[PDB]
Design an enzyme around this catalytic site. Sequence first.
Site, mmCIF file in Angstrom:
data_model
loop_
_atom_site.group_PDB
_atom_site.id
_atom_site.type_symbol
_atom_site.label_atom_id
_atom_site.label_comp_id
_atom_site.label_asym_id
_atom_site.label_seq_id
_atom_site.Cartn_x
_atom_site.Cartn_y
_atom_site.Cartn_z
ATOM 1 N N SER A 1 8.291 -10.138 -18.341
ATOM 2 C CA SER A 1 6.892 -9.584 -19.371
ATOM 3 C C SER A 1 6.720 -7.960 -18.786
ATOM 4 O O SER A 1 5.941 -7.290 -18.553
ATOM 5 C CB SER A 1 6.211 -10.855 -19.322
ATOM 6 O OG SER A 1 5.399 -10.836 -20.542
ATOM 7 N N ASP B 1 17.857 -28.229 -15.572
ATOM 8 C CA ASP B 1 16.384 -26.815 -15.664
ATOM 9 C C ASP B 1 17.075 -25.572 -14.930
ATOM 10 O O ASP B 1 17.498 -25.320 -13.756
ATOM 11 C CB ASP B 1 16.121 -28.366 -14.775
ATOM 12 C CG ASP B 1 14.890 -27.222 -13.106
ATOM 13 O OD1 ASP B 1 14.618 -25.965 -13.636
ATOM 14 O OD2 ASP B 1 15.119 -27.455 -12.214
#
Length: 330
Positions: A199, A35
């Site tokens: 992004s 994770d």
Amino acid sequence: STGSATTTPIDSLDDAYITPVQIGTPAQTLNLDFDTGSSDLWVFSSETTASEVDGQTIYTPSKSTTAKLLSGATWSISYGDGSSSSGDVYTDTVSVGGLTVTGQAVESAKKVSSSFTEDSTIDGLLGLAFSTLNTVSPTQQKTFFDNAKASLDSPVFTADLGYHAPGTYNFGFIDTTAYTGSITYTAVSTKQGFWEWTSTGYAVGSGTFKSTSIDGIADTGTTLLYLPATVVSAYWAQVSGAKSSSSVGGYVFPCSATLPSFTFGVGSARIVIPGDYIDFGPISTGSSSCFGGIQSSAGIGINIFGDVALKAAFVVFNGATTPTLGFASK
């Protein structure tokens, strides 16, 4: 040194991925959920409340000659889906794919929430976010990656998750045969303890690319792709019959649909998520309503590039003095 381990979806929907991890002496192999959105390595154990264990493999520290109780240390964590666990702490030898760390903090669960109990395939978590998020008290502990870093050939790990198929986590090297084209690297902020990046935008299907900054985290421990409501609405508007259902808890779509792809930007590069990756199947057995793999982050407080996004890429987690993230198509 290096390590290389295969990671395998837990079910037919890629709800999560498990990677075998050797703990203790002699080795006890547990299947852990790697994770990159948390920083605790915790396991089901011989100390876990009996009624809360249902099929998991447990770590038994008393059977490990290298286990030592970390005196006074406790831990308690809550995840984005509302699940939780807590317990005490041992140090022991931990190996992943041939890479060995001695003195790793292995957090032994005394209590786990129902969703952990109900998932027999996950024996615990191995956190790969920054150690500043580690929950051990009163002495915070380091992640497996943090402990291994100095010994690694290069201070990196990579995630190569499969779609309906096994994939690979590598430590200490970049497998240049595992991706196509070039890796594009992008800046990371560690201020919140995550692999947080921005992004450069998105496209829906064959549509034009929208240049827009989307700050979010690269999180292998989250199943879906969580993005701003504007982006998610633009995606689902291209699927006939799709709608946001408050009763189901997100966007659903007719199982008869053909889903469009979703592209996200990494600098000037583009990663394309095929439409099929966005299908999470019937909302309940036999239903013709299917759950979407792109969902709104509104009310989460952060955008999450979870498995839906990451599995479309070869992802480099670069733990150099100034960390960065790299993405390549594959």
